[PDB]
Amino acid sequence: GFKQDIATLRGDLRTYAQDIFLAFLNKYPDEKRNFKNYVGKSDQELKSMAKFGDHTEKVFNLMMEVADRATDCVPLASDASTLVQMKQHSGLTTGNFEKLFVALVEYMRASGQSFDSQSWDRFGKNLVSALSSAGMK
Ligand code: HEM
Numbered sequence: 205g206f207k208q209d210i211a212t213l214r215g216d217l218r219t220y221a222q223d224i225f226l227a228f229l230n231k232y233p234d235e236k237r238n239f240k241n242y243v244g245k246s247d248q249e250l251k252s253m254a255k256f257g258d259h260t261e262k263v264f265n266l267m268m269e270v271a272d273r274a275t276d277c278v279p280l281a282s283d284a285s286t287l288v289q290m291k292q293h294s295g296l297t298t299g300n301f302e303k304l305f306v307a308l309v310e311y312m313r314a315s316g317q318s319f320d321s322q323s324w325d326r327f328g329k330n331l332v333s334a335l336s337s338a339g340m341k
């Protein structure tokens with residue numbers, strides 16, 4: 205289930221984080237507008253760039269904490285506020301988070317592995333709901 209999936213992803217997080225974020229950026233290429241250091245790069249090139257691996261690993265470090273602290277895939281209101289209020293998320297709307305979770309569920313469904321992709325799809329929706337109620341546009 206979801207709790208075990210948090211453990212699996214944490215067991216190889218740097219790699220999962222890169223592969224999932226790359227799936228997100230390739231699936232929705234316009235989402236690179238938020239990450240202009242990443243334009244005109246292959247996946248292998250991005251995996252060589254220090255802030256791509258650093259920032260992506262910190263994104264998924266926090267995403268796993270939020271997941272871990274959820275009840276029935278519903279994140280804490282304090283976690284949604286933190287995500288809204290972050291200055292690096294000034295630009296952002298719930299559409300950006302929706303697309304990130306579409307890509308994460310698709311990755312999970314295409315993997316050889318017994319991830320609970322239904323739980324992750326609900327977590328994504330529930331997180332977008334929470335981000336809306338915390339005041340993200
Ligand atoms: C649950 C989902 C997400 C979590 C947990 C999260 C978390 C974080 C964290 C921890 C950082 C700081 C990274 C660092 O500087 O070391 C960060 C930065 C940032 N995040 Fe998010 N984030 C999420 C979703 C998104 C989405 C969907 C977007 C845009 C589509 C986004 C855009 C950014 C940007 C632009 C930065 C700063 C520039 C950069 O790090 O490249 N985030 N995020």
Ligand SMILES: CC1=CC=C(C(C)C)CC1
Binds near residue numbers: 256260292
């Ligand atoms: C904060 C942040 C999120 C995502 C990335 C890519 C490299 C995954 C870097 C910046």
